Every structure is written in structure tokens, then in C-alpha cells.
Design a protein around this nucleic acid. Structure first.
Ligand SMILES: [K+]
Ligand SMILES: [K+]
Ligand SMILES: [K+]
Ligand SMILES: [K+]
Ligand SMILES: [Mg+2]
Ligand SMILES: [Mg+2]
Ligand SMILES: [Mg+2]
Ligand SMILES: [Mg+2]
Ligand SMILES: [Mg+2]
Ligand SMILES: [Mg+2]
Ligand SMILES: [Mg+2]
Ligand SMILES: [Mg+2]
Ligand SMILES: [Mg+2]
Ligand SMILES: [Mg+2]
Ligand SMILES: [Mg+2]
Ligand SMILES: [Mg+2]
Ligand SMILES: [Mg+2]
Ligand SMILES: [Mg+2]
Ligand SMILES: [Mg+2]
Ligand SMILES: [Mg+2]
Ligand SMILES: [Mg+2]
Ligand SMILES: [Mg+2]
Ligand SMILES: [Mg+2]
Ligand SMILES: [Mg+2]
Ligand SMILES: [Mg+2]
Ligand SMILES: [Mg+2]
Ligand SMILES: [Mg+2]
Ligand SMILES: [Mg+2]
Ligand SMILES: [Mg+2]
Ligand SMILES: [Mg+2]
Ligand SMILES: [Mg+2]
Ligand SMILES: [Mg+2]
Ligand SMILES: [Mg+2]
Ligand SMILES: [Mg+2]
Ligand SMILES: [Mg+2]
Ligand SMILES: [Mg+2]
Ligand SMILES: [Mg+2]
Ligand SMILES: [Mg+2]
Ligand SMILES: [Mg+2]
Ligand SMILES: [Mg+2]
Ligand SMILES: [Mg+2]
Ligand SMILES: [Mg+2]
Ligand SMILES: [Mg+2]
Ligand SMILES: [Mg+2]
Ligand SMILES: [Mg+2]
Ligand SMILES: [Mg+2]
Ligand SMILES: [Mg+2]
Ligand SMILES: [Mg+2]
Ligand SMILES: [Mg+2]
Ligand SMILES: [Mg+2]
Ligand SMILES: [Mg+2]
Lengths: 73, 101, 88, 119
RNA sequence: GUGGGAGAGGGUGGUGGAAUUCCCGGAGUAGCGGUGAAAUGCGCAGAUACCGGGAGGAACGCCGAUGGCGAAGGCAGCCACCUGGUCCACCCGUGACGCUGAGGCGCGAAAGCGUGGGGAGCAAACCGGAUUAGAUACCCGGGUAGUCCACGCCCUAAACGAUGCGCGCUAGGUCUCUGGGUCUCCUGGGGGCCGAAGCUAACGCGUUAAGCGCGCCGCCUGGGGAGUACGGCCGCAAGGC
């Protein structure tokens, strides 16, 4: 049910369309380089849709990873 | 005449002279396509999330400019000829969309 | 695209009177500008059909407006055709 | 005879066979084992017990090179992955980290008919 | 018209990473693969597994959904350019300029055809291995056209909501997309579920009508024969109407 914490509630004022801010977009990624779903981010439809393309831009720039490796399995 | 943002990631192993020459070529190409610069933010070398050109780091440059649209792509090609320049991304400027306000 | 300055230019050029923004002549002139722009866009990129359909719809709308003008006042109809250079 | 004393261990586990390859921290292999290395020949290679035997055999072969600490790397979803994990975990070799690095594509190539109804 | 809005709507160019295959090198040894179980196959000319580098083609993981867009087919990495449709607010302009639509014309998944190119993966036909009473199959190892691209044809479908288009009227509740606003909520457009009246043979439909009405087009008149024959038109052919 993802009752741990919401990324939006665990954050303050920030720009969703900013693709250069890495320390904020790192929080929206999972343990892997995948994009967190709606239940983890706690965003809306439009917010999630903008976040998707901004994360893709940050990945192409080389700031966010396309994929990572799971640890402690 | 639209407003754009240019992100240029190049080799962080360049010395000051080679970096100065690369930035000189960048400014010269911007003048050759009529790109009026409004501001600039040079973040320096930063750690990449994945190796680009066999290098775990990259030197970043950002330019907010205003230029005619018809040659925007035609400018991007000119910035990809330099072997030191390894990433060029041009994005139309957009107003910030703030969340949790 | 079509900026606001060109739109206001053609509107004030084909306005029946200062303030008129929706008369038949203004609509036909705007449709003609859009049609010429789309034809110049479709000379190249000739594989685009979804915009070709919009071109067909604009042509039909302009033809219907010109038919209405022909029915009501043929003088302004001939004047509009002479100013825009339509019908070949 | 290299005396590595610290390396990595790749475990390629499939529904038909599980193979363990012990390499150096740079990826170059030293020794390895699988279900075919053990007396098992046919389908018995896709067995968790066979995977345990292969892991222990590769571990004992790595003992010849005097290796103590390992970094396990897991690839592929097959019967016997966790059994090989538990075999290498208590085999004299110190397991420092377990990493699942199964290569997942971004829907690039078309799979076989056996793996169709997907992309 | 003015000012705003959202979108995998379309076309062109460029560009990103993961993966598969192949090649080069390093390291390394007795099998890998595959199945209910096996064999063909590949491996001492050193495979499989591992690391690094290179090439190439094709498709875009998470986001992603019961979601969005389009007239339908259909559209899913990213960036730029060109471009279509659409919604809302203001009540601003024209002043019935509207609806439908036989023909005509254009678009039209996949497969197929022509020319040229491309060809990694997949894979009709086919070459084999198994299975079986037999296996011209399901299973397994290979593999051509093709899938891909450009241009030109082909007009088919479970082309499906099995529900033609437009307008008006007729209880609501709830979920959601997207605006606007006095932003508990109201209002507009779109996508779902449950249901008033009502309809239906029933299942079910029910402000996204299959309800109540109106306008216009298409089509049906028992089944097989048969979407066959003949004729005509179109098509290089396959064939289609
Ligand atoms: K053999
Ligand atoms: K849908
Ligand atoms: K050929
Ligand atoms: K609102
Ligand atoms: Mg370069
Ligand atoms: Mg096996
Ligand atoms: Mg699009
Ligand atoms: Mg080799
Ligand atoms: Mg083989
Ligand atoms: Mg082979
Ligand atoms: Mg042999
Ligand atoms: Mg030999
Ligand atoms: Mg291989
Ligand atoms: Mg490699
Ligand atoms: Mg090739
Ligand atoms: Mg999905
Ligand atoms: Mg729609
Ligand atoms: Mg469909
Ligand atoms: Mg009025
Ligand atoms: Mg009046
Ligand atoms: Mg119509
Ligand atoms: Mg018709
Ligand atoms: Mg077709
Ligand atoms: Mg086709
Ligand atoms: Mg062909
Ligand atoms: Mg060919
Ligand atoms: Mg094959
Ligand atoms: Mg086959
Ligand atoms: Mg056979
Ligand atoms: Mg039988
Ligand atoms: Mg027999
Ligand atoms: Mg081949
Ligand atoms: Mg042929
Ligand atoms: Mg359907
Ligand atoms: Mg229908
Ligand atoms: Mg029927
Ligand atoms: Mg509604
Ligand atoms: Mg119901
Ligand atoms: Mg009733
Ligand atoms: Mg009932
Ligand atoms: Mg309807
Ligand atoms: Mg109705
Ligand atoms: Mg009869
Ligand atoms: Mg019949
Ligand atoms: Mg009949
Ligand atoms: Mg037929
Ligand atoms: Mg026929
Ligand atoms: Mg005939
Ligand atoms: Mg003929
Ligand atoms: Mg035939
Ligand atoms: Mg035939």
C-alpha cells in the first residue's frame, strides 16, 4: 500500500520542470534507476506526466541513471 | 526569435587552454547563428550517473539564449563536430511548474 | 506559425469597419492565409495526410462562406475575389 | 596459482541449468562450475541441489587459489538461484554483497514464440 | 475574434541508453543448449559463463493506467522544426451563412506485389531432431521471402461499441482526465461504473440511450447453394467492388 512516506509530502517547494536539479529528482527514483509509481511519489496525473519527461531529460543529460543494480538480495 | 536553453557536456579532462578554445568555438558558433545570450551558468565538472565517452565525469555548460528557430537544429549540428563536446541538448524555454506550493 | 501581428494585419486589412473581427470577408481572408500556409507546408512533407484533411476542411469552409457571399451580395464577393486572387 | 584472496562470483541461473563463474574483481574468471561439471547430465542441472553442488565445487576450486572474500552477482531467473546463494554464503567463502544484475531489455528485440505475448 | 489550456495527433531531421547478434582482445575449461523426458545442433579451429572495446539493425523498460489523442485505421525513448484537430473564459464581431449526404475524390492495421536498398532479432515455405498407431502438427535445433526503409501499387478484417451522423428533451450517485470560477464546492468538455422514468424477446441499455422526438444517408426480407457463376469496373499479379 506504500504507507512509508510520500515523496511530495517529504519535500517542500520545488520546480517539476527543472531537469538540471539532480538532488530532488534522485528522491523520485527507486533503489533502481526506475521511475517511482504514483503511489510512491504521491503526485497527480499532470505532475507525474511532467516528472516523467523531466526525469528522461535528466537521464539523457547523464545526471540520472537509466538503471541501477539491486543490493542486499 | 524564440528563447532556448543549451546544455553542453564536454570532456572534464581538458586543461584551461583547451577549455578556453572549446568555449571560444562555442561562442563563435553562437555568433555565427545569431544567438543572443541572456545568461550563463558554468557548473564545472560533475559526476555522471553512467559513463559517457568512457569518462565517469563531465564538464557542464548552460546557456539561456534567444535565436531564430529555422536554424536551431542547424546550430546543434555545428556544436557536435568537436570531439571534446560529447553532449548537446537544446530545449525550448518553459516557465517553471512548481509543485507542493 | 501565424503570429498575432500578421493576424491583426489581415483583420484590419479586410475589416468592413473599425472593430469588425468576424465578418465574412475577414473569415475568408484568414482561411485563405491558413490555406496558403498549409499548401506551402504540404509541398514539402507531402507524406502528411492528417494535415491534408484539415486543409480539405478549411477549403470547404471557405467555399461555403464564398457561396453565402455570392448569394447575398455579389459585388463584395467579386471584390473579395479580386483582392485575394481566388478561383484561379 | 595467482593468490587472488578476493573476487566476484557470477551466478547464471536458468530453468534448464545454473552455472557459477568465479572471477577476479576485474571480471577475468579463475575457475567455474555448472550442472554439467557435476555428474548430472540432463534436466537434473535445473535443480537447486545441482546449483548448490556447482556453487560448492566452484568455491572449492577457488580455495585452491586461496580466495576468502567474494562479491556475488546474480543473473537470470531460474530454479536454484537462492540455493546457490545459500551454498556460497556458508562455504568458507565470505560473502560481502549480493547483487541481482539480470539483463532486462527496453523492448528492443522480438522474443521467440516460447516467450511471445509480450515485447 | 481576443486571451489561455491539455494531448503516444501528423510529417521531417537529429539524438540517448538497456538488450540481442556478430567481430577483436583479455581471462578461463569440459560442455553448452534444450525438453514431460530426449535427440538434432553447437564446442579442442577453445564454446557456454566473465570483463573490455567495436559494428549493425530493430524496438522504446520504469513512467504507464480501468489514462490521453485521432474521423477511422491507428499513435509510446528524447530534442528541434513544420503542421492539423480540440477545449475553456470574455459576450467582442458576422447575421441562418445550417444538418445529412446518392456519385466523385482522398485516407485506410496486417498480409501481399514492383524497383532499389537494408537485413540484428523474429520467422511462412523449407532442412532436420523428437512425439505418435501415423505427425505433411503442437515440442526442439536451423532457416528464405518477409518483417525494416524510400517510392509506387494493393482496399481486405471480429475496419468491433458487432450500436451511421447532427440536434433537442428526459432522476441521480460515484471514479477519473482536462480547463474556468465566489476552488467545502460550482460550472464546461471527455473517458468509466451503478442506477429513476422508460425501452428491450431476454441479456441488458439507461444525459457517452439501445429512452422520447425530428432530419438525411447506408443496409435487411428464411437456410444451403454463395460472396460462388456470368457481366462490368478497377488491379502488374494475388484479387477486390
Ligand atoms: K557430446
Ligand atoms: K483507452
Ligand atoms: K532480395
Ligand atoms: K482548478
Ligand atoms: Mg562530438
Ligand atoms: Mg538442462
Ligand atoms: Mg506526437
Ligand atoms: Mg575469443
Ligand atoms: Mg545452437
Ligand atoms: Mg547455430
Ligand atoms: Mg560434434
Ligand atoms: Mg587440444
Ligand atoms: Mg555469447
Ligand atoms: Mg561486450
Ligand atoms: Mg551487418
Ligand atoms: Mg505498462
Ligand atoms: Mg477522443
Ligand atoms: Mg483497436
Ligand atoms: Mg452580441
Ligand atoms: Mg448587427
Ligand atoms: Mg459532414
Ligand atoms: Mg461517400
Ligand atoms: Mg492498406
Ligand atoms: Mg504491409
Ligand atoms: Mg518488398
Ligand atoms: Mg527486396
Ligand atoms: Mg530462429
Ligand atoms: Mg522454429
Ligand atoms: Mg518436422
Ligand atoms: Mg495417437
Ligand atoms: Mg518410432
Ligand atoms: Mg543468419
Ligand atoms: Mg519476392
Ligand atoms: Mg472491439
Ligand atoms: Mg461499426
Ligand atoms: Mg448481425
Ligand atoms: Mg460527463
Ligand atoms: Mg447499468
Ligand atoms: Mg423499471
Ligand atoms: Mg434484470
Ligand atoms: Mg451513439
Ligand atoms: Mg441520443
Ligand atoms: Mg433461397
Ligand atoms: Mg452465404
Ligand atoms: Mg442467400
Ligand atoms: Mg472474399
Ligand atoms: Mg472473391
Ligand atoms: Mg468476371
Ligand atoms: Mg486487367
Ligand atoms: Mg490464393
Ligand atoms: Mg493463392
Amino acid at each position: 500500500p506504500s504507507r512509508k512516506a510520500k515523496v511530495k509530502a517529504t519535500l517542500g517547494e520545488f520546480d517539476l520542470r527543472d531537469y538540471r536539479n539532480v538532488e530532488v529528482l534522485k528522491r523520485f527514483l527507486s533503489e533502481t534507476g526506475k521511475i517511482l509509481p504514483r503511489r510512491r511519489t504521491g503526485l497527480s496525473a499532470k505532475e507525474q506526466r511532467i516528472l516523467a519527461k523531466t526525469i528522461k531529460r535528466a537521464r539523457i543529460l547523464g545526471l540520472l541513471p537509466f538503471t541501477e543494480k539491486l543490493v542486499r538480495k | 526569435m524564440r528563447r532556448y536553453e543549451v546544455n553542453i557536456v564536454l570532456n572534464p579532462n581538458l586543461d584551461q587552454s583547451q577549455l578556453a578554445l572549446e568555449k571560444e568555438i562555442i561562442q563563435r558558433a553562437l555568433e555565427n547563428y545569431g544567438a543572443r545570450v541572456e545568461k550563463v551558468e558554468e557548473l564545472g565538472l560533475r559526476r555522471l550517473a553512467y559513463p559517457i565517452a568512457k569518462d565517469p565525469q563531465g564538464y557542464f555548460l548552460w546557456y539561456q539564449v534567444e535565436m531564430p528557430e529555422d536554424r536551431v537544429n542547424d546550430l546543434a549540428r555545428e556544436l557536435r563536430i568537436r570531439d571534446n563536446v560529447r553532449r548537446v541538448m537544446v530545449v525550448k524555454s518553459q516557465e517553471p511548474f512548481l509543485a507542493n506550493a | 506559425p501565424i503570429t498575432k501581428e500578421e493576424k491583426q494585419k489581415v483583420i484590419q486589412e479586410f475589416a468592413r469597419f473599425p472593430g469588425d473581427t468576424g465578418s465574412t470577408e475577414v473569415q475568408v481572408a484568414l482561411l485563405t492565409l491558413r490555406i496558403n500556409r498549409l499548401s506551402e507546408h504540404l509541398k514539402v512533407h507531402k507524406k502528411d495526410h492528417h494535415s491534408h484533411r484539415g486543409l480539405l476542411m478549411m477549403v470547404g469552409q471557405r467555399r461555403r462562406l464564398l457561396r453565402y457571399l455570392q448569394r447575398e451580395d455579389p459585388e463584395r464577393y467579386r471584390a473579395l475575389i479580386e483582392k485575394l486572387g481566388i478561383r484561379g | 596459482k595467482r593468490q587472488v584472496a578476493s573476487g566476484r562470483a557470477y551466478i547464471h541461473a536458468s530453468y534448464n541449468n545454473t552455472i557459477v563463474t568465479i572471477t577476479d574483481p576485474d571480471g577475468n574468471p579463475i575457475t567455474w562450475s555448472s550442472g554439467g561439471v557435476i555428474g548430472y547430465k540432463g534436466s537434473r542441472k535445473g535443480t537447486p541441489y545441482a546449483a548448490q553442488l556447482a556453487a560448492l565445487d566452484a568455491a572449492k576450486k577457488a580455495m585452491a587459489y586461496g580466495m576468502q572474500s567474494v562479491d556475488v552477482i546474480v543473473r537470470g531467473t531460474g530454479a536454484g538461484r537462492e540455493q546457490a546463494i545459500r551454498a556460497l554464503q556458508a562455504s568458507g567463502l565470505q560473502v560481502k554483497s549480493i547483487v541481482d544484475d539480470t539483463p532486462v531489455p527496453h523492448n528492443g528485440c522480438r522474443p521467440k514464440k516460447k516467450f511471445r505475448k509480450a515485447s
